[PDB]
Amino acid sequence: QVRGLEVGMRNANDAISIAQIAEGAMQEQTNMLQRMRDLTVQSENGANSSADLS
Amino acid sequence: QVRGLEVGMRNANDAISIAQIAEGAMQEQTNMLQRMRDLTVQSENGANSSADLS
Numbered sequence: 832q833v834r835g836l837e838v839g840m841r842n843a844n845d846a847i848s849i850a851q852i853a854e855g856a857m858q859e860q861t862n863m864l865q866r867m868r869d870l871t872v873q874s875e876n877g878a879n880s881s882a883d884l885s
Numbered sequence: 886q887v888r889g890l891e892v893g894m895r896n897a898n899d900a901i902s903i904a905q906i907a908e909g910a911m912q913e914q915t916n917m918l919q920r921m922r923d924l925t926v927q928s929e930n931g932a933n934s935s936a937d938l939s
Contacts, residue, residue, distance in 0.1 A: 865888060868888070868889070869888055869889070869892050872889055872892040872893065872896075873892055873895070873896070875896065876896045876899055877899075877900070877903070878899045878900075878902075878903060
């Protein structure tokens, strides 16, 4: 039991590592989506022309 | 919401710019129409001849 609990805590820390990497990756994706939202709101401007839209 | 309000105020100022340019253009047109009105009233003078009318 003692030896198994030691190895199990090692596995639990491995799981925390995986979750932490993935969760940190999703933050930059959120950030870029916010930027695209601003660009889309800026497209709704009756003074833009086709070059500005491009 | 914060970021969208920022971009929306930018669009609103663009609209104010467009309206201000067009509204300023119409003033010279009004001015010239007043001048033509004076010329037309001056045409109604029983002392004018064809050269003055021209």
